[PDB]
Design a protein around this nucleic acid. Structure first.
Ligand code: MG
Length: 1308
RNA sequence: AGGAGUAUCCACCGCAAGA
RNA sequence: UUUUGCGGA
RNA sequence: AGUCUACUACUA
RNA sequence: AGUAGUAGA
RNA sequence: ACUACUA
């Protein structure tokens, strides 16, 4: 039953009125929103901003720090070993007890070194001892720490403690003294970092990346200093645990030259913590800025630079731990981009310099530098394009205090690069090296690489927790000023065309023209009414009568907001928690429409929370309560069903199929430009006009904040759908009316922050005055970011189509190709303008005749008519309250940017660096296989977006190395299988500490799971043809794995579970600490799950069962883990605990991975072939193409061309038929028919499961336990960036990858 | 002494004894 | 308010 | 630490 | 289907 | 929660 709500009634809008208004608008002269990019213009902007910047911030004489960890290296760095640490620590204490301290941060260092050196032999055993092999000492109370009482500190040493436990300024960048001294300092640091310290791919990578990047880089001090900072950060991470951070610690590296004195500090496990330490080092080539050193002690002409007490956040500490890995990935990406750009291998100097710059950026994890880089990814598109908002973007570049010599150096390099880029409008000077590029894609990829070298969240704890609110507040106030000025009815119901003509200031953001909105809906209807039947089928497909809280979105773990608490703030709860609350407080499971009926009068409460980004300004997103979610879900379902049917709307596309859609749009764009347009004169003369394209990489200034939800109300009421009634349309209009006003709550952090201030600044006072109650405030028309993405995107497409119709009406003589692609706010406008093919004596005469006849709008179309189209569009969109951004919107004849992917003509390029640098993120500590599979599969995505197979293989190697280093499993560590097993590392099953198929092409095409099967087959052949001991040992290892699994295939093919082998780690998952977890006793959940086995695969559609199902979900250990607010260190500690601690299940007891490996070795030594286990192996046994392929290296330089995106069908409802298999009850049957897309043929797809399993594994899935095991394997098309010549089939992509194994060489 | 900043923030919590 | 000793984050 | 759009792994 | 990771708006 | 042969 769809309710009867108010339906808005047509205004009778006529395109004639809008085309007449557009004629009047284009008749006059319009100031272009953008400025032409000229070298003189950019240089003058830089000079004027330099002159003005001296007054912005108080002058700074002393530059602040830029290096989080300072250290120097003169000899090759051997990475730390426990023996080397203790030898180097003793040597370093002997070194630095000779020096004479002067500063308190030198006396503390000397007094901690003297304490450490006075630790007994027993102290040195527990020191550097694993936690399981550690004892209390009364001087070494933790594995890597030692006590240091104040009783053991000099008078000045305790003064350093007093400073720690007891006014923004900018360097004068206008002066040449600072721009010389700061650049000279970094040029000395970078040059020191550049100093040299005294499968098919495995071969190709060895000759290409290793000989030309990882080897060239291997000798530099940047490489060894990166290893030294890995070991420093490993010590700091080891010191940041809850119990180890209370005490001090001394560690040393590079034969005692580098010493790390980790002071007591708050454990990084808890938030708002910093790992305070002092690093002392002999002054030499490296990350040293002697102006920012605490001391430089002298002894025998030797300089010992004592660094300041550097407090480092957990995010920054983990950044510095992967600083070498991030720098190496960035340099490999730059290396590949250089190879594609110039066709030549980068020179040694260029690679060393770019690695030094990348490593300095990875070390200097500063939000100031991160912000400047964030502005440079906007500045480079601005100063490269034809017209852009480069003056305003450069103004943004100077709205920052340059407080450190790196920011001054980075700014100076930015200024030089931007001025040089504006000279040409190919050639593209590099930001990190001297070599100039040829493709803008390489430069933009380079600067995005620099930007992504800064980890997300490098912002202030509360400085940027407040800044998210102000951006929302002002537009919630600008709306109020707009409402007061225009009457609160013009703003909400919308102004008419005659009002706009009378005022002409109404064409402003947050104000929408009613006639324009209706006409945009009409132009969208011109497409919709063609497929009205499909539109109606799509709308009624959505979950309108299907129950709420049965869709995964309404029961997910994503946070939502509850109600206003007694404190007055908005309660921060989980989506599932609110689902369970409403289900408990209701006697039935409501549908979407019924829940909207019951929850339409509540207000759309909301709360904003920071999405921890790397942007200069953190973009916090809103969290909506349950009624707001149901309103927005009604609107988004309606406008996703409607939007899926039109092609110029892109948020409705699927993932990377948006890239294919925009690629096809651009292909048709240059297809139209491939021609000469003809204008028909009264004499019938055909003026020939050269068709040209202008790509506007449009960005919307404050799309969600500063818009009007009300524009959609007249949109929905006029957007036609094939539905007979207007019942659903009226419901959607009502929902849009209910999302007009929002209760914007500021976070508890911000409220306590403001409530902990002695005085309130005037701008803070203005910000707080927005909320009338201390916490709540009113937001009008500003639909929260991302909540109406579908609806707003479709509205933008409609307004662009309306402008297209208006332009067609205005100039029917000119055939102009028009292609708009709105995703949500990012948009790409291709405007086809007919430039006069000659000097234009005819064209100018024709335009003059048109103007004289009465078409005054033709003044606009003579010179550069694309400007006229963009102006008219920027206006039409403004009539729909859409402001194309003056800055971050760039027009260009050739280059375009959409969805953070850069197009050049027919070519596309997505920067895969983000995937590669993001592949070094946290891991699931499930186990060694789960962690190795996650690490190795994160780079396959990059291989798809453009990554070179080597650069992806190198990333896989780095990820695998990190994962091993957290799990032993490294050669010469503790859990290395080769120590206890009798096979090589490559010939070891992944569960038993195996690297597996490290090759990316196997992981890209086959999968990680197939490495165990690929091993089994590789064993089976060895035990089927040669009958050697190695493959028999491998089979014994696999059989031991199955013995651990305790699953039984019994008679060949006729058993209980399907297995390949696994190991069971001691996963400690606590009990749920949430409100709706004790409602039903866990025993009741046990009986309920054992009876209703169908619901393990389909969400129940009845409130009575759904309550029990959701209570069970709250008690799921994985779900409990996902909602306990853990930290990335406790995760790292948990992975590392699987090195020495009793974390593995062997037999019936918990043993270490050492003992599991030993038991596996014993079993595989004693294993004997039963001729039935071989039958099991045959069943358990895309890789055919990979093992049967070969390539020939032609002596010719590899050619590079346009890159496109193509689909990839690697493998040929899946989770609901199993529910029908166990469907025993009437309610379960109803739920399984509701969940199934086509319930009629359920058994038809069940018989395929019976036949498919019997064909492959020969198992009787009719048994309950058997079917549950085959479900995970039953459940298991991507989109890749290839070259233009490559075909869109599965094998062609692999052929291209094989051809791309080399980088400067050719492969046939 | 750091991190963050033309938004006041983080940089350790409790206990018992002694000065 | 400093320290010492004991625990927790 | 949200909404969509996905991709990749891993788990019943 | 659930989690983890990543990317885009 | 570490310190291996560290891609
Ligand atoms: Mg854009």
């Amino acid at each position: 039953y769809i309710p009867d709500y108010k339906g808005m009634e047509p205004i009778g809008a006529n395109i004639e009125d809008l085309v007449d208004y557009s004629k009047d608008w284009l008749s006059r002269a319009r100031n272009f929103s953008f400025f032409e990019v000229k070298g003189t213009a950019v240089f003058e902007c830089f000079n004027s901003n330099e002159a003005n910047h001296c007054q912005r911030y108080p002058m700074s004489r002393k530059p602040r720090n830029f290096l989080l960890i300072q250290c120097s290296l003169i000899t090759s760095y051997k990475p730390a070993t426990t023996l080397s640490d203790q030898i180097d620590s003793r040597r370093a204490c002997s070194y630095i007890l000779n020096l004479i301290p002067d500063t308190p941060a030198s006396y503390l260092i000397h007094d901690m070194a003297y304490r450490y050196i006075n630790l007994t032999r027993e102290d040195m055993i527990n020191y550097y001892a694993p936690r399981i092999q550690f004892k209390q000492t009364q001087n070494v109370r933790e594995p890597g720490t030692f006590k240091l009482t104040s009783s053991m500190l000099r008078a000045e040493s305790k003064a350093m403690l007093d400073l720690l436990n007891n006014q923004i300024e900018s360097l004068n960048i206008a002066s040449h003294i600072v721009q010389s001294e700061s650049v000279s300092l970094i040029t000395k640091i970078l040059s020191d970092l550049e100093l040299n310290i005294t499968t098919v791919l495995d071969k190709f990578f060895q000759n290409e990346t290793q000989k030309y990047l990882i080897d060239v880089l291997k000798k530099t001090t940047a490489w060894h200093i990166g290893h030294l900072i890995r070991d420093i950060t490993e010590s700091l991470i080891a010191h940041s645990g809850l119990k180890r951070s209370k005490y001090w610690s001394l560690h040393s590296y590079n034969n005692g030259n580098v010493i790390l004195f980790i002071l007591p500090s708050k454990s990084l496990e808890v938030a708002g913590s910093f790992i305070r330490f002092i690093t002392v080092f002999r002054i030499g080539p490296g990350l040293v800025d002697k102006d920012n050193l605490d001391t430089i002690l002298i002894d025998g002409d030797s300089q010992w630079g004592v660094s300041k007490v550097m407090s480092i956040d957990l995010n920054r500490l983990l950044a510095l731990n992967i600083a070498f890995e991030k720098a190496l990935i960035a340099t490999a990406t730059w290396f590949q981009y250089y190879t594609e750009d110039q066709g030549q291998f980068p020179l040694q100097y260029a690679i060393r310099s770019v690695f030094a710059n990348h490593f300095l950026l990875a070390i200097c994890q500063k939000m100031k530098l991160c912000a400047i880089f964030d502005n440079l990814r906007y500045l480079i598109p601005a100063v490269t394009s034809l017209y852009s908002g480069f003056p305003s973007l450069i103004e943004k570049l100077f709205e920052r205090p340059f407080k450190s010599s790196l920011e001054v150096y980075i700014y100076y390099n930015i200024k030089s690069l931007l001025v040089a880029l504006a000279q040409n409008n190919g050639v593209y000077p590099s930001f990190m090296s001297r070599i100039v590029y040829k493709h803008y894609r390489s430069l933009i990829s380079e600067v995005t690489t620099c930007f992504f070298l800064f980890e997300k969240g490098l912002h202030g704890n509360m400085n940027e927790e407040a800044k998210i609110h102000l951006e929302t507040v002002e537009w919630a106030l600008k709306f109020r000023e707009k409402e007061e000025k225009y009457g609160e009815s013009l703003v909400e119901n919308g102004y008419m065309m005659w009002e706009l003509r009378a005022n002409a200031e109404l064409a402003e953001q947050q104000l929408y023209c009613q006639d324009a909105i209706e006409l945009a809906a009409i132009e969208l209807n011109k497409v919709l009414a063609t497929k009205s039947s499909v539109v109606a089928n799509s709308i009624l497909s959505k979950n309108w009568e299907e129950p709420y809280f049965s869709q995964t979105r309404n029961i997910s773990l994503k946070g939502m907001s509850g109600q206003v608490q007694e404190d007055g703030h908005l309660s921060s709860s989980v989506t599932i928690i609110e689902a369970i609350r409403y289900l408990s407080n209701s006697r039935h499971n409501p549908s979407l429409l019924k829940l909207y009926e019951e929850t339409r009068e509540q207000k759309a409460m909301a709360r904003i929370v920071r999405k921890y980004q790397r942007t200069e300004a953190d973009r916090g997103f809103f969290i909506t309560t349950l009624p707001t979610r149901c309103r927005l879900e009604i609107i988004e379902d309606y406008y996703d069903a409607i939007a899926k049917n039109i092609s110029e709307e892109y948020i409705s596309y699927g993932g990377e199929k948006k890239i294919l859609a925009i690629q096809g749009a651009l292909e048709k764009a240059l297809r139209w430009a491939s021609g000469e347009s003809f204008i028909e004169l009264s004499n019938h003369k055909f003026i020939r006009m050269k068709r040209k394209l202008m790509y506007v990489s449009a960005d919307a200034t404050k799309w969600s904040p500063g818009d009007n939800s009300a524009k959609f109300r007249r949109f929905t009421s006029m957007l036609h759908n094939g539905l007979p009634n207007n019942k659903l349309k009226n419901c959607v209009i009502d929902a849009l009316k209910q999302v007009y006003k929002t209760d914007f709550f500021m976070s508890r952090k911000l409220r306590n922050y403001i409530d902990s201030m002695e005085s309130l600044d005037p701008h803070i006072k203005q910000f707080l005055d927005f909320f009338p109650d201390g916490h709540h405030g009113e937001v009008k028309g500003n639909w929260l970011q991302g909540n109406l993405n579908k609806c707003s995107s479709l509205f933008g497409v409609a307004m662009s189509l309306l402008f297209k119709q208006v332009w067609t009406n205005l100039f029917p003589e000119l055939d102009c190709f028009f292609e708009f692609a709105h995703h949500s706010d990012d948009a790409l406008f291709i405007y086809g303008y007919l430039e006069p093919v000659d000097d234009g004596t005819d064209w100018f005469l024709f335009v003059s005749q048109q103007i004289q006849a009465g078409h005054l709008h033709w003044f606009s179309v003579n010179t550069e008519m694309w400007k006229s189209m963009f102006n008219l569009h920027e206006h039409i969109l403004l009539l729909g309250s859409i402001k194309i951004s003056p800055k971050k919107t760039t027009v260009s004849p050739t280059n375009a940017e959409f969805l953070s992917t850069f197009f050049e003509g027919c070519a596309v390029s997505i920067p895969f660096v983000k995937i590669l640098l993001g592949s070094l993120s946290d891991l699931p500590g499930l186990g060694y296989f789960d962690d190795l599979a996650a690490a190795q599969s994160r780079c396959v995505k990059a291989l798809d977006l453009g990554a070179s197979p080597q650069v992806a293989q190198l990333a896989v190697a780095l990820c695998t190395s990190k994962v091993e280093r957290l799990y032993g499993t490294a050669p010469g560590m503790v859990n290395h299988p080769a120590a206890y097993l009798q096979v090589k590392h490559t010939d070891t099953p992944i569960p038993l500490g195996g690297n597996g198929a490290m090759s990316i092409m196997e992981l890209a095409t086959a999968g990680i799971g197939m490495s165990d099967k690929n091993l089994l087959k590789r064993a089976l052949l060895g035990y089927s043809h040669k009958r050697q001991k190695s493959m028999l040992y491998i089979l014994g290892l696999f059989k031991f794995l199955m013995k651990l699994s305790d699953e039984t295939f019994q008679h060949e093919r006729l058993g209980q579970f399907s297995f390949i082998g696994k190991v069971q780690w001691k996963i400690f998952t606590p009990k749920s600490e949430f409100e709706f977890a004790d409602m039903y006793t866990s025993k009741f959940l046990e009986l309920w799950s054992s009876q209703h086995v169908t619901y393990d695969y389909i969400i129940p559609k009845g409130r009575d069962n759904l309550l029990i199902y959701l209570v069970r979900k709250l008690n799921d250990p994985s779900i409990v883990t996902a909602m306990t607010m853990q930290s990335p260190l406790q995760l790292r500690f948990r992975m590392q605990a699987k090195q020495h601690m009793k974390v593995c299940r062997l037999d019936g007891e918990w043993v270490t991975f050492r003992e599991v490996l030993a038991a596996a070795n014993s079993f595989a030594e004693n294993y004997s072939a039963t001729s039935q286990d071989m039958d099991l192996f045959q069943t358990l046994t895309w890789k055919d193409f990979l093992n049967g392929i070969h390539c020939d290296v032609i002596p010719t330089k590899q050619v590079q061309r346009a890159k496109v995106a193509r689909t990839f069908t690697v493998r040929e409802s899946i989770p609901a038929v199993i529910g029908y298999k166990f469907a025993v009850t009437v309610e379960e049957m109803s739920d399984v028919l509701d969940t199934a897309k086509f319930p009629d043929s359920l058994s038809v797809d069940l018989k395929t499961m019976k036949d498919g399993v019997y064909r492959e594994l020969g198992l009787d899935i009719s048994l309950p336990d058997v079917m549950k095991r085959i479900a995970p394997m039953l459940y298991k098309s991507r989109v890749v960036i290839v070259q233009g010549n490559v075909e869109g089939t599965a094998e062609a992509i692999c052929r291209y990858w094989l051809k791309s194994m080399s980088l400067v060489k050719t492969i046939r």
